[PDB]
Design a protein around this ligand. Structure first.
Ligand code: SF4
Ligand code: SF4
Ligand code: SF4
Ligand code: SF4
Ligand code: SF4
Ligand code: SF4
Ligand code: SF4
Ligand code: SF4
Ligand code: SF4
Ligand code: SF4
Ligand SMILES: [Cl-]
Ligand SMILES: [Cl-]
Ligand SMILES: [Cl-]
Ligand SMILES: [Mg+2]
Ligand SMILES: [Mg+2]
Ligand SMILES: [Mg+2]
Ligand SMILES: [Mg+2]
Lengths: 167, 623, 623, 167
């Protein structure tokens, strides 16, 4: 059965243990901008975790000119062949949520691969007691795709909700 | 290089030049990072003319540093080091800015800032790009406006440049408020509204250079580490231990405002006239229910999440934002001023945060002034209004005067020590008996009289950071409380609140990052000891305006020998003769001579024999 | 007895009398509770003169009821039953008030309310104390003010009286707003700002009796249960299943506003002129980030916590408060009006909640009026202002006119069905073709044309509750979706959203409570069947102002036969001759004759033979 | 090792599963006013869980005229001998948080007994994912006693925090 990461920004503490865990898992080093989940804090205390939602029409996969991106048949996650990637940015532009990220000196995009079915970001978030990330099990629902949006938009929405006309 | 980049940025604001300078393995094995590395740079460049260096003049250096554990160990701290406008020594300060992390991911371990810009500037670091930029439009802004304008604008600039690489996370920013801009001697350097490089007056050093802010963004990996598998194992072990500190994660230091006074009788009340109270209004239960809009907030990679955000939607101080507030603000901007009500405390904490003023040395000078008003020494006419205990509106008025250096504010803007000297001369009355400082730095909100707190007898009296309660001395002088171990955390750079694994385990973690083989004994007998000895030397060389003499200034403020007036240990206070005994014993154990001046032989053994030239100048002044 | 108290309160507002009447086991085994028990009371007391009972007249009965599962099964619902000002039948409505729990803990299973108070009153129930009290100070208050004045005052009153017994929890309260007070025919009964007995117009019934609110507090235990150990095992089982509904607990019905239109093409858009949209502004992600201040809110004993609280701190509508909002409000106060943005939808939801108006039948009449305006039938001068799609300010003005029964509002306050008749007569134009109702009750926000939703062909056409999407009919008529099973949940009385264990398990749980031995076959062939038959009979008797004829009124609004104009099943709509065939089959399967009138033989087998007297009066009217 | 229940009212959903669990455990029946933890919702959406804090000076124990109350030596919970209780209300009045409660027809006060050292309210709150209740395991701290406060006071503080001057 497939999984999807449901995000509750107002429970995010900004601990960024999800970034430490993800980048250590996939890069073997601490590397905030290569984590496949990245937390945006554009105003202190308004923390917005951001990652792939596995759009069923995969705009990123279909935009790639070198076929470096494919879809894992088991998980539905995007899979990056780093050696075919020419860091052209087409997938970055195609993504409704601007999720693909090319960090300095990697020479490839990075995109969440759902840790092959057992997200380590969710586990550490739950272990720390925040539960800003939670797994939903079951078939994909089209509304999932509407969560791919620009993190600056989410940040500004939340700031206005918390602070009102004083923001 | 493992764990470090091996590079510092060198920024000359007078000439408007930027270069990279090498950081050698030899220097790093000798001084480690942060506080220790900054103390060495300051002595190397300025030690020969120290007593001529004005901390608010062009010649001072403002150092923004990291250490090998910065970016890998849980939590996040950047080090700030300079010649201090308060003590005329050095303070190893820290604040939970990701600036250190962003620097290391951009390829640098820190920044040497020299000179003075002709008009307000900010420093911009984005990977290989380093620019000095005009900051005239932002001069005068508090932190809230600065995040909404400069920092948002710099993020948008980065986003548009990097469009084909995705959306970068936000840059990190350290900044000053109007208090630093106006060179108030206890102004702080701020980050994220409510975090501070609190002790030392480094906000005035930054303002004296016309530097409004430093903004940094890096998108590369941290340096390689020597033993990555050991690092990951220790990391999991550290997380699991730190997750279990249940009440510290739920409340942070917010239970201090009640607990330190009520349980330990060691909280300043009305300029330390009392140290005990029974008042439940200041309990964390009320801060939480009345003001906390975010109960769990954390800095980069932190499993503790000790931070909280308080915010007022009601009352005359609607719009005020602060943290739990930190216990030191609950004490120094609250009980020290006779104020116990959460709403009032969040208001005054917000003011010092927005103004970029250290809440400890600010609360100290405000309570000093209020005691002088109580005793008839400062009149209503001297102030321009009445300054009663408990009146948060009057204290806010006094803050305004201090930042604008207007009226009495011009005197008070110089800090409690210098202000007490000035007022003593003006009034023909000794008001230094009411000034609660050591070596020019206000005593943090932990007293010694009750002996129920961790501070006792010589904690402040012999420390190279004076009244700084985050770097107190212990007996035995080595041993795992005390200056040598704090020198490690301030050099490692890591947060005190994540050190549950303990000194030895954290040293071992740093070896797994760096490939060094430092032992606890080497830290206590060589590396930390040489850092403390250089700090002692710079502090003893002193001012241009203020000098210390250890035969009178290695001591507690006289109020700390007055018996406690109230509470479960009413009547208690230490005896000055026992303090003198312990001070002489501390000298012996740390390697100072009978007069408290580092022994020339110890300096040679420590590998800083060249500092004998400084010990020699200390002796003719004193003789 | 087991699981019930065996008592109802009987409250006469005309004579200002209160008494207790007995609730026999035989009645309970035959009608169970809630909707079923209320249908029986209405038929027995009024069925012989039903067509002369004005639902807004003093001879109607307002029944506040529970069932045996109320207080033990997870979640919390109270049942409200009366003669409906909309359909002139009966609606078994429910709302998540703890009133039912508080009644049972005070010794009662429900309240029969008769007559009409001379002046506004409220009903106060505190264990053995029952009082009719003056409410003229509260008449005209919406929910927020009513909680802050009346409810708080009653709590304080009780707290002071029970001082030596400790502090009681808050009493439960159901109430009406200004819509109910002015007898708008689609006014609702409210609780906790955001919960409603939505369908049926019962707010107008309650306001026609001059009854502002009912407030109940009990502190005793619930009735004894027959099999405690079985009950506990089942409860643990149910909690564990219900905890696992991840997306429903996180989002409730809040994803509906996007999902039903985009995915199922069955959402009303501009008075049902379309049923598909592609507009992502209304997605739950934007309701959450822009408006939600409480993400997990729950009623008594509920492991699902499907509720949320939305609140505006910014914009022209700051201060508005609502729930997710519920999907039906996102549709009928949103997409049905051409409005997709969360801020505007939270505003309009807040208004109908504060005014005590059913959001479904309110949104229906607003969209009706806006289509009449679109088509030139209602002019700017008829309204006083323009009524364009998407203009939340114009819809809010229209709401004001309706509640004040001012201008065109006097006609619109009668509900879509009656208002369409009146405007047809006035304009000489058939506008009933634009009125989307069945049996005088607006169709809920789930269309039949696409056949991608749970509603299809005869869902509304033959239901004894008309357009009520929460009690639709199915083929086969028995069988676990459809009227009979919903009659059980509305009688049990439990929340639909908590029924994951399934019909058979929940029936088993009820036997464990009550000592009964009801089987699912017995519910579908006898108990539920007799409830449906009585409701069918009362609905067909109708009157006094509106009567139904099953040969034309067991059918869909004509818009549901127009092909869908847009979306992935563009062109789809059912065929009226297929609908006619399925209706005749439903009659057969449910026990009605060929004209849709309950068979006298079936009534006698169901133990309700007396109803032949009513079936006999339906037939003279019809022939 | 002793335990103490730390409460976070802003994470309380009002599910009142703690009341169901506690009353079933101690009375064998569902009885909301006999639960030893009771949730107050004086304004919709502002939920305040309320229970004993084990004051070290036990005002309740020391006020009882019939010595119906004692202190468990292992836990430090209050223990009620229901047979000696004359429902006089002295413990109700002495309690700084007005915690003791005499429900209709019980014939005795009820006070949290910490479930003998394993609170069932905490367990269900944690299982439900709310975590408004959590156990702290060290030695008692004096500040714990300051949490024994009138629930109406906490309720109004929170409403003013959330809704500001518009409340
Ligand atoms: S771990 Fe959870 S709480 Fe911490 S940053 Fe990641 S998402 Fe936010
Ligand atoms: S979210 Fe962006 S990256 Fe992930 S699937 Fe959709 S397009 Fe690809
Ligand atoms: S960046 Fe790499 S992955 Fe993205 S499209 Fe271009 S080549 Fe393919
Ligand atoms: S699921 Fe795995 S890959 Fe995706 S973000 Fe979480 S940790 Fe990284
Ligand atoms: S413990 Fe507190 S201060 Fe230290 S890093 Fe973590 S959150 Fe920041
Ligand atoms: S499911 Fe939602 S509506 Fe039903 S009882 Fe639980 S919270 Fe209330
Ligand atoms: S269980 Fe937790 S969340 Fe539910 S009511 Fe009790 S304390 Fe609140
Ligand atoms: S809280 Fe009240 S009941 Fe509990 S110990 Fe203190 S006095 Fe006794
Ligand atoms: S009520 Fe019962 S427990 Fe409380 S004091 Fe009176 S007798 Fe003792
Ligand atoms: S600890 Fe046990 S007795 Fe105390 S409240 Fe929780 S469940 Fe009830
Ligand atoms: Cl703000
Ligand atoms: Cl970048
Ligand atoms: Cl409000
Ligand atoms: Mg702070
Ligand atoms: Mg420090
Ligand atoms: Mg609602
Ligand atoms: Mg219904």
């Amino acid at each position: 059965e497939r999984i999807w990461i449901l995000i509750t920004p107002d429970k995010c503490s900004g601990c960024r243990l999800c970034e430490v865990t993800c980048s250590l898992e996939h890069e073997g080093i601490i590397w905030p901008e290569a984590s496949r989940i990245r937390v945006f804090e554009l105003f202190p205390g308004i923390n917005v975790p951001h990652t792939c939602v596995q759009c069923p029409d995969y705009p990123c996969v279909n935009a790639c000119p070198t076929n470096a991106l494919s879809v894992d048949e088991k998980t539905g996650a995007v899979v990056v062949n780093e050696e075919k990637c020419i860091t052209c940015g087409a997938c970055v532009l195609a993504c409704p949520g601007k999720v693909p990220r090319i960090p300095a000196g990697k020479g490839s995009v990075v995109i969440c691969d759902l840790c092959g079915g057992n997200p380590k970001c969710v586990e550490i978030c739950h272990e720390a007691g925040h539960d800003a990330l939670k797994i939903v099990t079951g078939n994909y629902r089209p509304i999932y795709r509407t969560f791919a949006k620009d993190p600056q938009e989410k940040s500004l929405d939340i700031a206005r909700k918390v602070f009102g006309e004083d923001f | 290089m493992y764990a470090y980049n091996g590079k510092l940025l060198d920024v000359d604001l007078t000439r408007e030049k930027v270069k990279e300078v090498e950081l050698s393995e030899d220097v790093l094995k000798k001084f480690y990072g942060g506080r220790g590395l900054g103390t060495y740079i300051l002595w190397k460049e300025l030690g020969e003319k120290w007593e001529k260096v004005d901390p608010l003049g062009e010649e001072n250096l403002l150092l923004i540093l990291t250490g090998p554990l910065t970016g890998y160990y849980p939590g996040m701290k950047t080090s700030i080091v300079s010649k201090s406008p308060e003590s005329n020594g050095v303070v190893g300060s820290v604040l939970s800015s990701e600036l250190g992390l962003e620097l290391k991911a951009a390829g640098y371990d820190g920044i040497i800032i020299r000179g003075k810009a002709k008009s307000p500037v900010y420093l911009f670091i984005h990977n290989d790009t380093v620019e000095i930029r005009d900051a005239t439009k932002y001069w005068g802004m508090g932190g809230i406006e600065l995040y909404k304008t400069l920092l948002k604008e710099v993020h948008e600039e980065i986003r548009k440049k990097e469009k084909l690489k995705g959306v970068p996370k936000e840059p990190a920013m350290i900044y000053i408020g109007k208090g630093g801009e106006n060179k108030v001697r206890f102004a702080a350097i701020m980050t994220k509204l409510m975090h501070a490089a609190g002790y030392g007056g480094y906000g005035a050093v930054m303002g004296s250079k016309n530097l409004k802010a430093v903004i940094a963004k890096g998108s590369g990996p941290l340096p390689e580490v020597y033993d990555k598998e050991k690092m990951k194992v220790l990391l999991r072990e550290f997380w699991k231990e730190l997750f279990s500190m249940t009440t510290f994660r739920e409340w942070g230091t917010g239970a201090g405002g009640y607990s330190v006074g009520h349980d330990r009788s060691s909280e300043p009340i009305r300029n330390w006239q009392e140290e005990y109270h029974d008042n439940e209004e200041i309990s964390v239960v009320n801060f939480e229910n009345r003001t906390w809009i975010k109960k769990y907030w954390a800095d980069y990679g932190c499993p503790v999440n000790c931070m909280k955000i308080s915010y007022l939607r009601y009352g005359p101080y609607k719009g005020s934002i602060s943290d739990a507030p930190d216990y030191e603000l609950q004490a120094y901007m609250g009980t020290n001023l006779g104020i116990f009500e959460p709403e009032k405390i969040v208001y005054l904490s917000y003011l010092v945060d927005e103004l970029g003023l250290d809440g400890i040395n600010t609360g100290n000078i405000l309570g000093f002034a209020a005691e002088l008003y109580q005793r008839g020494i400062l009149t209503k006419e001297d102030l321009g209004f009445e300054l009663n205990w408990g009146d948060e509106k009057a204290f806010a008025k006094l803050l305004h005067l201090i930042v604008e250096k207007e009226g009495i504010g011009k005197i008070l803007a110089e800090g409690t020590y210098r202000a007490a000297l000035k007022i003593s001369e003006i009034k023909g009355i000794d008001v230094t008996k009411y000034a609660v400082h050591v070596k020019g730095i206000a005593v943090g909100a932990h007293g010694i009289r009750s002996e129920l707190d961790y501070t006792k007898d010589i904690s402040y009296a012999v420390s190279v950071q004076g009244g700084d309660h985050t770097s107190t001395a212990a007996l035995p002088a080595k041993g795992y409380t005390g200056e040598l171990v704090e020198a490690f955390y301030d050099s490692a750079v890591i947060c005190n609140f994540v050190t549950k694994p303990g000194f030895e385990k954290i040293i071992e973690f740093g070896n797994a990052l760096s490939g060094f083989n430092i032992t606890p004994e080497q830290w206590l007998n060589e590396i930390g000891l040489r850092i403390i000895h250089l700090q002692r030397i710079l502090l003893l060389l002193g001012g241009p305006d203020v000098y210390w003499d250890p035969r009178k200034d290695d001591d507690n403020p006289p109020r700390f020998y007055e018996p406690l007036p109230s509470g479960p240990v009413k009547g208690k206070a230490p005896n000055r003769e026992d303090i003198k005994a312990k001070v002489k014993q501390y000298y012996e154990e740390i390697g100072y001579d009978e007069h408290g001046i580092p022994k020339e032989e110890v300096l040679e053994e420590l590998g800083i024999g060249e500092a004998k030239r400084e010990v020699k100048r200390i002796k003719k002044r004193l003789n």
